[PDB]
């Protein structure tokens, strides 16, 4: 049962997928292979909710029905800074220009 | 005249829909549509030699089918069951479908959304979205070759 | 395994290489690509398109709608044409 995700920190967005049954920790292992930071140097979030390593993505509320390939769910990512974690910070995408009047 | 140059343009548009199922049978169309929302539709080839194409659509009572004829360069709905006097004629069969879809937004024909045989190109999905916003391709801030691309498929479905 | 696609405003999208090969233009290019004319509100949607295209080609699943807001559609059309996808 596949969930399709955007893992986001600052100006970095990882597109990946996983199962409802896989764990938060297994997501951190995916992030580790891409960004080369170990799981214990990562915090993962759904909105402002810090995710426990032991929980399944389904247990955190990521569902196949709402994390689709055409509309992936966002997981926030914060990294270790020195002796603590940086605050979660996801930088927005650019904003679209104004619609031409005839398509309004 | 059958106007084969017009027919080929119409069949090219049909190839672009992503909801043309080709040699699909009536039974296969029934199975694909048996559980779809009311108004879900596709187009496929007709088993009947007097007809070019068939619309298969989910009604409240189950999938049903409606043939399209192509005569003298014009597509129209089956004139054996429709009053040929009240039948609009189209140069384009995708136009025919789009017209009835939009008229439904405003056995009876009720069409909503197509059942796709394959995921369209991102360019085509953009084209559809733009066509749902406007028909005024001529004035969009696009390079000419993209305007020509939009012109090849002007429909909202 | 993964490639990095960078928008004009400096967002980095890390996507499966196999999914990025949906674009003939990326595929002919090929681990990092810079798109000087595609901003992040376009390129993020391109990346979702890649996931959707791979999932719903040659599948038995009913193909769902791919959402495109009208405000990105013109730029998205230009990007998809440049990307050949
Ligand atoms: C303005 C128009 C009004 C309109 C009128 C009608 C009348 N429709 C028929 O009476 C068709 C006749 C037909 C049957 C097969 C067919 O397929 P093909 O062309 O391949 O032979 C084409 C037409 N009856 C069926 O569908 C019954 C059926 C269903 C499922 C199945 F599994 C096998 C048969 C339908 C909608 C409308 F809005």
Residue numbers in the entry:
A (entry chain B): 1 to 104
B (entry chain A): 30 to 135, 148 to 198
C (entry chain C): 17 to 46, 58 to 112
Quote the passages of the study that discuss this structure, keeping the authors' original sentences:
The Src homology 2 (SH2) domain recognizes phosphotyrosine (pY) post translational modifications in partner proteins to trigger downstream signaling. Here, we use structure-based design to target the SH2 domain of the E3 ligase suppressor of cytokine signaling 2 (SOCS2). SOCS2 can tightly bind to adaptor subunits ElonginB/C and scaffold subunit Cullin 5 and RING domain protein Rbx2, to function as substrate receptor of Cullin 5 RING E3 ligase complex CRL5SOCS2. In this work, we describe the structure-guided design, using fragment-based growing, of a pY-based covalent small-molecule binder targeting the SOCS2-SH2 domain.
